[PDB]
Design an enzyme around this catalytic site. Sequence first.
Site, PDB file in Angstrom:
ATOM      1  N   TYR A 130      -2.126   4.893 -19.343  1.00  0.00           N
ATOM      2  CA  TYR A 130      -3.277   4.898 -18.469  1.00  0.00           C
ATOM      3  C   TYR A 130      -4.106   6.121 -18.820  1.00  0.00           C
ATOM      4  O   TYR A 130      -3.976   7.168 -18.179  1.00  0.00           O
ATOM      5  CB  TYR A 130      -2.831   4.962 -17.001  1.00  0.00           C
ATOM      6  CG  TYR A 130      -3.846   4.427 -16.012  1.00  0.00           C
ATOM      7  CD1 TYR A 130      -3.515   3.401 -15.136  1.00  0.00           C
ATOM      8  CD2 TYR A 130      -5.130   4.940 -15.949  1.00  0.00           C
ATOM      9  CE1 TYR A 130      -4.433   2.908 -14.207  1.00  0.00           C
ATOM     10  CE2 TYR A 130      -6.062   4.445 -15.024  1.00  0.00           C
ATOM     11  CZ  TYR A 130      -5.700   3.432 -14.158  1.00  0.00           C
ATOM     12  OH  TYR A 130      -6.611   2.937 -13.249  1.00  0.00           O
ATOM     13  N   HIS A 178      -4.785   0.408 -17.021  1.00  0.00           N
ATOM     14  CA  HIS A 178      -5.690   0.092 -15.912  1.00  0.00           C
ATOM     15  C   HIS A 178      -5.809  -1.416 -15.670  1.00  0.00           C
ATOM     16  O   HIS A 178      -6.558  -1.850 -14.782  1.00  0.00           O
ATOM     17  CB  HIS A 178      -7.082   0.661 -16.194  1.00  0.00           C
ATOM     18  CG  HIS A 178      -7.664   0.167 -17.481  1.00  0.00           C
ATOM     19  ND1 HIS A 178      -7.159   0.534 -18.708  1.00  0.00           N
ATOM     20  CD2 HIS A 178      -8.680  -0.694 -17.730  1.00  0.00           C
ATOM     21  CE1 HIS A 178      -7.859  -0.061 -19.665  1.00  0.00           C
ATOM     22  NE2 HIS A 178      -8.785  -0.811 -19.099  1.00  0.00           N
ATOM     23  N   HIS A 182      -1.728  -4.942  -8.608  1.00  0.00           N
ATOM     24  CA  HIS A 182      -0.877  -4.418  -7.538  1.00  0.00           C
ATOM     25  C   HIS A 182       0.165  -5.429  -7.035  1.00  0.00           C
ATOM     26  O   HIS A 182      -0.100  -6.627  -7.022  1.00  0.00           O
ATOM     27  CB  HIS A 182      -1.741  -3.974  -6.353  1.00  0.00           C
ATOM     28  CG  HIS A 182      -0.961  -3.742  -5.096  1.00  0.00           C
ATOM     29  ND1 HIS A 182      -0.308  -2.558  -4.835  1.00  0.00           N
ATOM     30  CD2 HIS A 182      -0.720  -4.549  -4.031  1.00  0.00           C
ATOM     31  CE1 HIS A 182       0.296  -2.639  -3.662  1.00  0.00           C
ATOM     32  NE2 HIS A 182       0.064  -3.838  -3.155  1.00  0.00           N
ATOM     33  N   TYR A 190       3.750   3.927 -11.980  1.00  0.00           N
ATOM     34  CA  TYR A 190       3.009   4.898 -12.783  1.00  0.00           C
ATOM     35  C   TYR A 190       3.897   6.116 -12.958  1.00  0.00           C
ATOM     36  O   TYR A 190       4.552   6.527 -12.018  1.00  0.00           O
ATOM     37  CB  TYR A 190       1.767   5.352 -12.025  1.00  0.00           C
ATOM     38  CG  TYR A 190       0.755   4.271 -11.806  1.00  0.00           C
ATOM     39  CD1 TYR A 190       0.300   3.500 -12.861  1.00  0.00           C
ATOM     40  CD2 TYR A 190       0.249   4.019 -10.540  1.00  0.00           C
ATOM     41  CE1 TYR A 190      -0.643   2.504 -12.665  1.00  0.00           C
ATOM     42  CE2 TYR A 190      -0.690   3.027 -10.336  1.00  0.00           C
ATOM     43  CZ  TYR A 190      -1.137   2.279 -11.404  1.00  0.00           C
ATOM     44  OH  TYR A 190      -2.073   1.289 -11.203  1.00  0.00           O
ATOM     45  N   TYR A 220       0.122   0.109  -5.711  1.00  0.00           N
ATOM     46  CA  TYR A 220      -1.025   1.013  -5.763  1.00  0.00           C
ATOM     47  C   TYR A 220      -0.907   2.145  -4.737  1.00  0.00           C
ATOM     48  O   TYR A 220      -1.472   3.223  -4.924  1.00  0.00           O
ATOM     49  CB  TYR A 220      -2.342   0.250  -5.561  1.00  0.00           C
ATOM     50  CG  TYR A 220      -2.828  -0.560  -6.762  1.00  0.00           C
ATOM     51  CD1 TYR A 220      -2.061  -0.693  -7.913  1.00  0.00           C
ATOM     52  CD2 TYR A 220      -4.063  -1.196  -6.732  1.00  0.00           C
ATOM     53  CE1 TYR A 220      -2.522  -1.445  -8.999  1.00  0.00           C
ATOM     54  CE2 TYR A 220      -4.524  -1.938  -7.805  1.00  0.00           C
ATOM     55  CZ  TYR A 220      -3.750  -2.057  -8.933  1.00  0.00           C
ATOM     56  OH  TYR A 220      -4.216  -2.802  -9.990  1.00  0.00           O
TER      57      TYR A 220
END
Length: 235
Positions: A130, A178, A182, A190, A220
């Site tokens: 990311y 990206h 979700h 992450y 998320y």
Amino acid sequence: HGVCWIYYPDGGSLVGEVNEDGEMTGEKIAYVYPDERTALYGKFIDGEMIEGKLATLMSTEEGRPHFELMPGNSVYHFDKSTSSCISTNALLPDPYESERVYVAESLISSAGEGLFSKVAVGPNTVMSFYNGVRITHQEVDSRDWALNGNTLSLDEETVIDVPEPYNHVSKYCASLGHKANHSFTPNCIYDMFVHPRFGPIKCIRTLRAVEADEELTVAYGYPEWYQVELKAFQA
Ligand SMILES: CCCCCCNCCN(CC[C@H](N)C(=O)O)C[C@H]1O[C@@H](n2cnc3c(N)ncnc32)[C@H](O)[C@@H]1O
């Protein structure tokens, strides 16, 4: 005094002989990805990639790595983003990521594109990076919500973003993290990552075994679509 290896907590590493000041400087230095096979080999100054050619770590003998260059002219350099420059080469993919994930239409309805695995892998596997531009929390938290579909906090000082038009694969495919959608039952998280091209960023790391062509999701951890899905999940 001979070959030195510097591992990162994320599993990647720098390997080579150091100079008199103990610096990773020379023409035979390598960054090795967390698979301990995929490598960028060539010219580094004090650990920083100047010219890394795609290579494979074929074997190691008493700590001494044997690299074999991959075919082609794939070269990479330390190319850390700024607040407005995402990359010097937006269309140059990451070779480790390219072997592990692809972008396709998400299986989540009305969610757009998603990120999918190319391979069956085990728990804790780094799959995707990311990268993005680097802006402050104030800039992010003090602007239209609609500008923040791709914002991911990096640390206390920095937020990563992939703004328009870089949210389109046709304009930016250097990294693909990206594109992960979700879920409240995610199969990835992450995680911090020190990348020889992108510098300090985040990556997508599996929480468990994932199959080939399985959609990769992350929670998320907070937007309309989200609060709806929340209601759908509590039931
Ligand atoms: C730490 C907080 C997370 C920061 C990183 C967020 N990056 C999100 C990027 N979007 C994913 C890629 C998007 N599908 C696309 O085609 O570029 C997310 C967008 O995709 C849709 N989306 C994602 N998850 C979804 C879900 N569970 N349900 C419906 N829509 C979803 C929605 O439009 C969202 O803005």
